[PDB]
């Protein structure tokens, strides 16, 4: 026997069959929760107000769990187990609260604030009724790890990921105060003992470090300076990385030994390297609070002794106002130089270090990517560097599109770092010995035998286990002396990567992704919940989700766009690429050239040699004029042989007669295979007409710039089923050309192009032989610029074919084309 109890808010309701024996207490709870429930609003888009019935049950669960005692099993445990079971039998069809909170955000009018309230309220209510996550959650990731399909590494963030680290630590203590409560008081008692133990700490820490006080009461929380000061910033980033790691392991229901055992390896960035060894050693929940005490003691002693070494220095208001007037950020001993090569930044450092003595020099501290460097020195000598750098940077409101690429002024964003000590700087070198003495005095040593999985050094990328010297000496020496090489350390092979670092969405996870996109490494941002709109990196939800859509890896461009060989019945060998598969001829075309491909002879003589050539619209002025040429092609070529038509997009009159002319020749079954729009890209409406009306097999396009490529992709979106041949041509091409370098725009867009599989990306502009094409067929061309291989579907040869025997070019023009020597890419802009 059961008695129905409804909980409603305006239009949304939920019915819960409460046992009639204890029903009269569930209507005592229902009135008091519906008092806590605000006034109803249209859309339910008000904050601290449920939007879904699911978020109303999760708000009730959290209201009842807020009153339950984890010692004294009161009456409200026997009313949580019936509304948390209905939660599991209404909403949680297998998957966690996180993979369905990801459903809510993207589908219903649900926000990240009330989603992280639902996560907190469910997680408090599950562990409140004394139901810890003990079972092994069968996440498709882990299933694949067990089967061997997936490999995981656990990266760990350093400093400067965010302006405020402490807000991720407040969000962990907000959502997970029930689970983290053990680590926070333990760390607060280790540090508040060290302070009375280690000398000078009491001086280093003025407002003290009883973190328990500032996490219970957010109001007393000091500025992000006493917090930003590294003797406090380091240990609390040590804490938050373990806090993510433990929160993951708990939710899963694995021991820190099991989660550690699963991972192929682990690594950290700057001072996150300590967390990686702290999780590599650990075996059991009991044998965790020894890895915690080590990590916290190390980060404490680096922090304290580095702040006593090179101290923070007061700064003239005259420098601070100028630095924040150019939006270069608040001056600090760490400066990030986005979108520039390493050699460039070292050049500028050398130029600034010319005017400075040895004690005040600036030195490249980090390389956090291909083009994402950090420099370190005295704030004044960094300002002195910044003065030189703002004299190179182009104005942000400038259009350079009409300027040659070599004449263009380089565009880049330099900023200062949210940090209060020059990490990986010679300035802190006198602290190394003192740190090492304070470690040995407290007896903190990481033994190479205790570390279970490999852990990758920041400086050289080697395993820390195989170290001859002290592991705690090497870690310190890596943090305060050695410049981190993030593209060197992340040279391991994996399928997924787990970001337990602070920062999340702007964390180290996304940085490593952009550093490694297209090597088939589905990186996971494990430190935050949200949905990736484009879906190239994951979040918290696919850690747990117990489905088939848990294993959805990233692409490995060198693999699925590896050119093959294939053979027909005749023993003819074809190069197989995405493009040649469609057209059934080699993926080599001759693009519409006025006047080289005007001649109906040269269009038929190229087709009868078994190749795809465009008839040049440019050369014809009336529907009759072209129609004669087409017919002459049709009469000359063999049966079943095809060809295409090239229409310039700056001649509206041509398009006006042309587009009908094709449309009705398609209607009469004329062998017109494809239309190539040259010199611009049609609008979505014009392209949508051309694709759906003219009954082609695919639409050629020659986008001019990056913006044009953006539009070409937008047409490829609108019409996903219809093949598009993006015929990308650099400025270095013959005839009507742009000002662009042939390479760079691909190195920006190539990812985004390959996301839509219908686009046959056809490279060209420069080529006249197999040798120089080979790098672009394979995808190795892009290795030179420090990218993953990015292989192309096919080519086009304008200028190379102009001296062919069946081209109408006058015999004296051919001697003039031949005579021309030509020049390598680099020189073309002259």
């Amino acid at each position: 026997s059961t008695r129905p109890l409804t909980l409603s808010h305006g239009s949304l309701e939920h019915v819960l069959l409460v046992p009639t024996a204890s029903f009269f207490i569930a209507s005592q709870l229902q009135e008091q929760f519906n008092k806590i429930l605000p006034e109803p609003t249209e859309g339910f888009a008000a904050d601290d107000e449920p939007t879904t019935p699911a978020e109303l049950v999760g708000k009730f669960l959290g209201y009842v769990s807020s009153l339950v005692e984890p010692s004294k099993v009161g009456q409200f445990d026997q009313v949580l187990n019936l509304c948390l079971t209905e939660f599991e039998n209404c909403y949680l069809e297998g998957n966690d609260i996180h993979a369905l909170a990801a459903k809510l955000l993207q589908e219903n009018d649900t926000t990240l604030v009330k989603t992280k309230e639902l996560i907190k309220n469910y997680i408090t209510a599950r562990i409140m009724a004394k139901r810890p996550f003990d079972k092994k959650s069968n996440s498709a990731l882990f299933r694949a790890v067990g089967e061997g399909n997936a490999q995981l590494v656990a990266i760990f963030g350093g400093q400067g990921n965010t302006d405020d680290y402490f807000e991720e630590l407040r969000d962990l203590y907000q959502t997970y105060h029930v689970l983290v409560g053990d680590l926070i008081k333990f760390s607060a008692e280790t540090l508040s003992e060290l302070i009375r133990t280690t000398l000078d700490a009491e001086k280093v820490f003025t407002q003290g470090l009883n973190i328990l006080e500032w996490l219970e009461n957010p109001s007393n929380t000091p500025d992000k300076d006493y917090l930003l000061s590294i003797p406090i910033s380091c240990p609390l980033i040590g804490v938050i990385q373990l806090a993510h790691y433990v929160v993951t392991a708990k939710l899963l229901g694995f021991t820190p030994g099991e989660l550690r055992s699963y991972l192929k390896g682990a690594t950290g960035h700057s001072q996150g390297l300590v967390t990686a060894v702290a999780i590599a050693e650990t075996d059991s929940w009991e044998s965790f609070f020894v890895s915690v005490r080590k990590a916290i003691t190390v980060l404490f002693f680096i922090g304290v002794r580095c702040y006593e070494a090179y101290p923070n220095t007061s700064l003239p208001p005259s420098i601070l106002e100028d630095s924040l007037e150019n939006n270069e950020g608040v001056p600090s001993p760490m400066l990030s130089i986005s979108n520039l090569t390493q050699e460039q930044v070292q050049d500028y450092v050398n130029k600034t270090n010319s005017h400075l003595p040895a004690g005040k020099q600036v030195e490249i501290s980090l390389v956090n990517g291909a083009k994402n460097l950090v420099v370190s020195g005295p704030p004044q000598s960094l300002y002195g560097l910044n003065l030189t750098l703002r004299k190179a940077k182009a104005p942000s409101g400038l259009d350079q599109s009409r300027i040659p690429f070599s004449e263009r002024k380089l565009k880049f964003s330099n900023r200062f770092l949210p940090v209060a000590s020059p990490f990986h700087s010679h300035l802190l070198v006198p602290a190394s010995d003192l740190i090492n003495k304070d470690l040995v005095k407290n007896n903190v040593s990481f033994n190479a035998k205790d570390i279970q999985i490999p852990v990758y050094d920041t400086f050289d990328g080697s395993d820390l286990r195989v170290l001859s010297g002290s592991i705690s000496e090497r870690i310190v020496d890596c943090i305060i002396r050695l410049p981190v090489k993030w593209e060197t350390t992340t040279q391991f092979k994996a399928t997924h990567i787990l970001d337990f670092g602070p920062g999340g969405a702007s964390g180290l996870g996304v940085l490593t992704h952009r550093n490694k996109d297209g090597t088939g490494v589905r990186v996971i941002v494990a430190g935050t919940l949200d949905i990736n709109p484009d879906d190239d990196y994951g979040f918290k939800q696919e850690i747990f989700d117990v489905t088939s859509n848990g294993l959805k890896k990233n692409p490995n461009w060198l693999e699925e766009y590896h050119p093959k060989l294939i053979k027909n019945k005749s023993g003819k060998i074809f190069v197989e690429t995405k493009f040649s598969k469609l057209i059934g001829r080699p993926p080599l075309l001759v693009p519409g050239m006025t006047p080289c491909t005007v001649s109906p002879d040269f269009v038929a003589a190229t087709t009868n040699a078994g190749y795809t050539i465009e008839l040049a619209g440019g050369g014809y002025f009336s529907a009759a004029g072209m129609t004669a040429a087409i017919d002459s092609v049709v009469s000359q070529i063999e049966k079943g042989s095809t060809f295409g038509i090239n229409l310039i997009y700056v001649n509206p009159f041509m398009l006006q007669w042309g587009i009908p002319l094709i449309k009705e020749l398609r209607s009469k079954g004329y062998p017109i295979q494809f239309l190539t729009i040259g010199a611009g890209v049609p609008s979505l409406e014009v392209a949508s007409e051309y694709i759906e009306t003219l009954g082609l097999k695919y639409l050629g396009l020659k986008p001019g710039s990056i913006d044009a490529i953006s539009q070409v992709i937008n047409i490829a979106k609108a019409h996903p089923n219809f093949p598009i041949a993006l015929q990308w041509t650099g400025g270095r091409g013959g005839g009507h050309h742009s000002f662009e370098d042939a390479h760079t725009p691909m190195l920006q867009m190539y990812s985004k192009i390959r996301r839509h599989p219908n686009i046959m990306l056809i490279f060209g502009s420069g080529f006249g032989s197999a040798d120089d094409t080979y790098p672009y067929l394979t995808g190795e061309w892009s290795t030179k610029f420090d990218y993953p291989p990015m292989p192309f579907d096919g080519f086009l040869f304008g200028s190379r074919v102009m001296i062919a025997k069946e081209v109408k070019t006058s015999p004296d023009a051919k001697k003039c084309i031949a005579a021309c020597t030509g020049v390598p890419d680099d020189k073309w802009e002259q």
Binding site: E39, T41, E42, G43, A45, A46, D47, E49, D109, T111, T162, D163, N327, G329, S396, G397, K411, S413, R415, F416, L417, P418, G503, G504, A505, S506, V510, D530, P533, S683, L684, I706, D707, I709, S710, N714, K717, Q748, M749, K752
Partner: protein, 163 residues
């Protein structure tokens, strides 16, 4: 008063102004989103997710483009449509500042009656409400109508229509 589809330069401006927590005069359009946000990339990447929720397609790297060059690019494929994000942003603006009970329909007919301002003006009018959000809930109904008069006077000044 003549009805036109909402201007996608005002919409963008309100988003960036309300998103950073700044007024309409402080942030000019001749400035990139990276410049005004400064350091914080946590803001940037989900401003780029909010612009992708409004208009859908965005340019390549709309981070370092002035908001004239970005607004102008939205005019190509925009037509008056508030969509999802701005419609929910006005739904959590009313349900936080307008007195408990005040509906959008009230304000709309009120703008139609007092001012003669149709739906294509009222979208842009509600965007001026959000961007210059009042501090606390305007419990007094008259105070909510005295705010709706001052913001419809900022809308009529900015657009350049006499009211």
């Amino acid at each position: 008063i003549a009805d036109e589809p909402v201007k996608a330069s005002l919409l963008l401006h309100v988003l960036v102004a309300h998103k950073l927590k700044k007024s309409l005069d402080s942030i000019p359009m001749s400035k990139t989103i990276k410049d005004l946000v400064g350091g914080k990339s946590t803001v940037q990447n989900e401003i780029l997710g909010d612009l992708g929720k409004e208009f859908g397609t965005t340019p390549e790297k709309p981070e370092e483009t002035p908001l004239e060059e970005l607004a102008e690019t939205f005019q190509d494929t925009f037509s008056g449509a508030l969509g999802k994000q701005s419609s929910s942003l006005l739904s959590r603006l009313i349900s936080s500042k307008m007195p408990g009970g005040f509906t959008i329909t009230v304000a709309r007919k009120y703008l139609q009656t007092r001012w003669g301002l149709p739906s294509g003006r009222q979208d842009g009018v509600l965007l001026v409400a959000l961007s210059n959000e009042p501090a606390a809930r305007l419990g007094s109904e008259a105070d909510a109508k005295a705010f709706l008069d001052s913001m419809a006077q900022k809308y009529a000044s900015i657009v350049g229509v006499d009211l």
